[PDB]
Amino acid sequence: NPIRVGVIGCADIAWRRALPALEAEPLTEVTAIASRRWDRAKRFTERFGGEPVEGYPALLERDDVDAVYVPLPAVLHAEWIDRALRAGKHVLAEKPLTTDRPQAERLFAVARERGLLLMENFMFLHHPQHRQVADMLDEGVIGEIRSFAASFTIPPKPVGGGALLDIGVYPIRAAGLFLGADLEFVGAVLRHERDRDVVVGGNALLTTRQGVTAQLTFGMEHAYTNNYEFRGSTGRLWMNRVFTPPATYQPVVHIERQDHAEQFVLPAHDQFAKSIRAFAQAVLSGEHPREWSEDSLRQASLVDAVRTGARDIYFP
Ligand SMILES: NC(=O)c1ccc[n+]([C@@H]2O[C@H](COP(=O)([O-])OP(=O)(O)OC[C@H]3O[C@@H](n4cnc5c(N)ncnc54)[C@H](OP(=O)(O)O)[C@@H]3O)[C@@H](O)[C@H]2O)c1
Ligand SMILES: Cc1cn([C@H]2C[C@H](O)[C@@H](COP(=O)(O)OP(=O)(O)Oc3ccccc3)O2)c(=O)[nH]c1=O
Ligand SMILES: [Cl-]
Ligand SMILES: [Cl-]
Ligand code: NA
């Protein structure tokens, strides 16, 4: 019996990534899709199946929904996640899970009281390429890790939560994935467009307590980049398309050390399918990994520490 999934919000990420995953995944059945405009829901249901629903409360009321996918804008996550959990639905929430750490802790407490799964949908964590990179780093391919950089920048597109919340979250999450649980804020700059009043870009510096640093760049006034890079005591490793590799795209790991470089081609994987599968498997089994929520909470704290500690610059 697949878990029956309802979607609140006919989002770009839903149309492009999450819904094709849900539709294909045997463990999940799209039963309803809701929108502020019925016609938009109906267009989504014509594409992916399920019943179109006007407005979000009506979807939360359905007996044929077991879990709700929430690809709303960041600032609206907390209200709708809170309501979906109170209606008894497990929830797959897009990143960033919510807008700060205290709010994230309130949402997990509500889920906890009900035995429900709340998962942050960082689908990139489900791509095997990062564990293959981390195993190479662990085998010493570039010696001891000294520093780390990651970047996710995209060209300006036609409100939103700003470049920090919707994009900078990725490189920040990669830093925690690779460098571990004790990352602390050191400094950052966020550039705010005075015109529309919105973060359009930034750069942050984090460090572990041993002094392994992370320089994270993000933004939406930029050419496409989507990469990370390790500097080690005897080498360096970098890779491109780290956050949004196609399903069919084969990663290429680049290593450089003294007088020798190598590139390794890895197998292609569907991280969108794999993330949806992990969510569905956790729901069906009742095994809700503790690491996922602890990682989301650490993540929310570092995102807060960056918003709060950043030098804010308004242009022009
Ligand atoms: N697109 C991406 O690949 C991408 C990239 C990075 C991060 N994200 C994250 O994914 C989530 C959604 O991002 P998105 O890029 O897919 O956004 P999006 O295309 O704007 O989708 C958000 C959906 O939320 C609904 N909504 C409800 N109230 C709204 C309001 N006041 N203003 C705008 N939309 C409202 C709309 O659905 P209805 O009109 O159907 O109600 C809208 O289609 C956010 O947490 C974001 O950080 C997405
Ligand atoms: C390949 C590529 C993409 N984009 C644009 C196209 C798109 O506007 C943006 C991101 O494309 P992608 O990394 O594929 O991410 P998803 O759309 O799956 O998820 C996000 C969408 C928006 C923000 C973050 C993630 O960059 C480019 O401009 N050039 C490129 O080579
Ligand atoms: Cl992701
Ligand atoms: Cl390449
Ligand atoms: Na600040």
- Let me know whether 312 and 182 are in one domain: yes
> Is 69 annotated in some ligand binding site?
no
Calpha distance 77→83 (Å, rounded): 10
Instruction: Report angle CA 51, 55, 61 to the nearest 5 degrees.
Output: 70
Pair 143, 112 in one domain: no
d(CA 148, CA 236): 10
Domain end position, chosen among 102, 126, 150: 126
Q: Are 12 and 95 in contact (CB under 8 A)?
A: no
One domain for residues 281 and 136 = yes
Q: What whole-number distance in Å separates Cα of residue 196 and Cα of residue 162?
A: 10
CA-nearest residue, atom 7 of ligand 1: 166
The owner of tokens 């992990």 is 278
With a 6 A CB cut-off, is 155 part of the ligand 2 pocket? yes
Exposure b/e, 195-211, CB count within 10 A at least 16 = b: eeebbbbbbbbbbbeee
Statement to judge: residues 69 and 119 lie in one domain = yes
Q: What is the dihedral of CA 274, 277, 283, 286, to 10 degrees?
A: -70
Helices (H), 167-239: 169-179
Residues of the domain holding 283: 127-316
For ligand 1, is residue 63 a contact (CB within 6 Å)?
no
- Tokens 């919105």 belong to 198
**How far apart are the CA of 109 and the centre of ligand 4, in A?**
42
Q: Whose CA is nearest to atom 43 of ligand 1?
A: 11
Give the pairing type, strands 3-8 and 28-35.
parallel
Instruction: Say whether both 159 and 86 belong to one domain.
Output: no
168 and 107 co-located in one domain: no
Same domain, 248 and 315: yes
Q: Residues 117, 165: one domain?
A: no
Pocket test for ligand 2, best of 152, 170, 222, 244 (most atoms within 8 A of CB): 244
203 Cβ closer than 6 Å to some ligand 2 atom: no
- Helix 290-309 / helix 169-179 crossing angle, nearest 10 deg: 120
∠ Cα 305 116 11 (to 5°): 65
- Please tell me whether residues 305 and 193 are part of one structural domain: yes
Mind giving me the DSSP string for 54-68?
Answer: ESHHHHHT-TT-SEE
Kindly report the CATH number assigned to the domain that includes residue 58. 3.40.50.720
Among protein residues, the one whose CA lies closest to atom 31 of ligand 2? 224
> Which two structure tokens, joined as six digits, stand for 104?
């994230």
Q: How far is the CA of 227 from the centre of ligand 4 (A)?
A: 10
Do 63 and 151 fall into the same domain? no
Give, in order, the Cα–Cα distances in Å from 300 to each of 98, 214, 227, 307: 8, 17, 22, 11
From 100, 126, 152, the end of a domain falls on 126
The bridge status of strand 213-219 relative to strand 145-153 is parallel
Is the C-beta atom of 167 inside 6 A of ligand 2? yes
> Among 15, 154, 165, 228, which residue has the most ligand 2 atoms within 8 Å of its CB, making it the best to mutate?
154
> Domain total for the chain?
2
Rounded Cα–Cα distance for residues 7 and 86 (Å): 16
**Is 177 a known ligand-binding residue?**
no
Q: In angstroms, how far is CA 161 from the centroid of its own chain?
A: 14
In the reported structure, the alpha carbon of residue 154 is separated from the centroid of ligand 2 by a whole-number distance in angstroms of: 6
- Residue 166 CA to residue 143 CA, distance in Å, equals 33
Experimental determination technique = X-ray
Ligand nearest to the CA of 202: 5
Protein residues within 5 Å, CB atom, of ion ligand 3: 122-124
How deeply is 42 buried, as exposed, middle or buried, from its count of CB atoms within 10 A (0-12, 13-18, 19+)? middle
Q: Is 157 found in the same domain as 116?
A: no
Q: 190 C-alpha to center of ligand 5: Å?
A: 8
Ligand 1 close to Cβ of residue 74 (< 6 A): yes
- For position 194, which CATH number holds? 3.30.360.10
Share in percent of the chain as helix, strand, coil (round to 5): 40, 30, 30
Cα 48 off chain centre by: 23
73 and 165 both lie in a single domain:
no
126, 141, 171 - which closes a domain: 126
